[PDB]
Amino acid sequence: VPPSGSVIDDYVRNASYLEERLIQMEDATDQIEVQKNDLEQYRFILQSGD
């Protein structure tokens, strides 16, 4: 077994990059629900009450 490449550092940076992007994107499409749900309910009022 000889040494492997020291691109360990390359992996450091790129894996960081990718995981921060993951953290950003994951919690983005999450709370869209919190704002859309209230009006998705209010469509009920939009259906009657005149």
Partner 1 sequence: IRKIAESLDANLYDVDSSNEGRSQQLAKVNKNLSDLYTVLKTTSTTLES
Partner 2 sequence: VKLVEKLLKNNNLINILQNIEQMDTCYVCIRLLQELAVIPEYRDVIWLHEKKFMPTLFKILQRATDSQLATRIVATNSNHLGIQLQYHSLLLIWLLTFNPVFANELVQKYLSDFLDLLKLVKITIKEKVSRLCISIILQCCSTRVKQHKKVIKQLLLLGNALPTVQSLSERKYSDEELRQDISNLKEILENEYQELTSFDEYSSELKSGRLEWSPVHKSEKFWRENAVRLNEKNYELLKILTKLLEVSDDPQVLAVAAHDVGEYVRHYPRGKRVIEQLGGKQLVMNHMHHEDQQVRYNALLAVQKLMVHNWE
Question: Which residues make up the interface to partner 1 (CB under 8 A)?
Answer: 22, 25-26, 28-29, 32, 36, 38-40, 42-43, 45-46, 49-50
39: contact with partner 2 by CB under 8 A: no
Residue among 28 and 47 whose Cβ is closer to partner 2: 28
At residue 13, what are phi and psi to the nearest 5 degrees?
-65, -45
- 35 token code pair: 């704002």
Q: Could you give the 3-state DSSP secondary structure of residue 30? A: coil
Distance of closest approach, residue 21 Cβ to partner 1, in angstroms: 10
- Please give the Cα distance from 28 to 10 (Å, whole number): 27
